[PDB]
């Protein structure tokens, strides 16, 4: 029943300001009880700030030095994050929450399904497949590589789905400026009998390389 | 300020077993201390409360205990999904409501040795400009690899890019690329390409290479 949606993604040059919005449906709870937290990629999570039951308006995580502020609309049952003079360390994933014993069987636990957002200096670019050849030099391994891309859902198939077995697709990396890279496995008989393609469907740029893979010859 | 400690970062058990997590405040936080689950993709979810009370719907081989300064989470026996990161928070009056490192419970299984492959950039990508040069390791256990880059038998630091899978759920082993970076112009002022591997199931190093230029 009771649910807490978030904003949309969000990219912000860094400097400037971002402010995530947090609306819950169901339940009856007061606003200001929504608490924020984030959490940077592949790192824990660290909380932002919130109101401690026994004060009246909320506190922030020190670090942040000021840059932080939460607000809570009544009215729209809206709890709003506003995080200013972005650095590129705030670039995480941020979760608005209700824990703790407010007043109704146990602590609650109501969580948003969280909202990217993503500082830094660049700016958007759809990205090119380069062909990670089987060697002719038993098992072969072959691939795709997805270099200099912004936009970040880069999905990847292999022969439109029909192929899944031994796939592995890496997390992406970021450079000094500015990458990922998708394998499979496979027999080595098969090599020029079937014919193996990636599929990168990267959704925000509208790009739809499907690149194919073969076997590297001589002269 | 209150500091959470979560040692060890990393516990490796077998499906089944008994798993104690450990967390360790820089001064007493009485019993005011949460645990919480965090699944691949999805938010966290709050686990134990108040050092040792399970949180509604949650099962019961998971339990808190401890008080002021040192605290465990077990889980009796863990199941599948279990197999997650933890963390706790400290949840007192004194903010900031600092939450411990985490820590990440791992399938142990047995030593397996990486298969290693490597990859000259394509002709595709040098007419581009740049020379991207990957080497895989694939399906390894445990997680601990080092890949060392060779460029004419000269180490290669602070010049290439590692990522890695999540523990794979069929087998249980993880997979790494390796990714060497060189501008065009750089890589053509060089001969033989090797990434080194040295892993826990080897008895020696890998050496994957090739010289620019040949098949």
Partial sequence: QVQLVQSGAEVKKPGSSVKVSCKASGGTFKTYTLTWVRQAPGQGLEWLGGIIPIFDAPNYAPKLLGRLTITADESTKTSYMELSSLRSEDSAIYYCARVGDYGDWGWFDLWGQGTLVTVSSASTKGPSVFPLAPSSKGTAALGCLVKDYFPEPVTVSWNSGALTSGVHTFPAVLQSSGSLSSVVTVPSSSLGTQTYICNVNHKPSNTKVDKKVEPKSCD | ?215
Avoid: M
Wanted: glycine residues 6%; neutral net charge.
């Fill in chain 2, 1 to 215: 300020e209150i500091v959470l400690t979560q040692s060890p970062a990393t516990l490796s058990l077998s499906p089944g077993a008994r798993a104690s997590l450990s967390c360790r405040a820089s001064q007493s936080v009485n019993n005011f201390l949460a645990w919480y689950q965090q699944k691949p993709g999805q938010a966290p979810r709050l686990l134990i409360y108040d050092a040792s009370k399970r949180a509604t719907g949650i099962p019961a081989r998971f339990s808190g205990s401890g008080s002021g300064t040192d605290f465990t989470l077990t889980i009796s026996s863990l199941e599948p999904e279990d197999f997650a990161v933890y963390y706790c928070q400290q949840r007192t009056n004194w903010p900031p409501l600092t939450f411990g490192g985490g820590t990440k419970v791992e399938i142990k299984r047995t030593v397996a040795a990486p298969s290693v492959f490597i990859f000259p950039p394509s002709d595709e990508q040098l007419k581009s400009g740049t020379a991207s040069v990957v080497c895989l390791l694939n399906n390894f256990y445990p997680r601990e690899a080092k890949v060392q880059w060779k460029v004419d038998n000269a180490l290669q630091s602070g010049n290439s890019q590692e990522s890695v899978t999540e523990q794979d759920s069929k087998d249980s082993t993880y997979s790494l690329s390796s990714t060497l970076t060189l501008s065009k112009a750089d890589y053509e002022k060089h001969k033989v390409y090797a990434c080194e591997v040295t892993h826990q199931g080897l008895s020696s190093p890998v050496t994957k290479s090739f010289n620019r230029g040949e098949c």
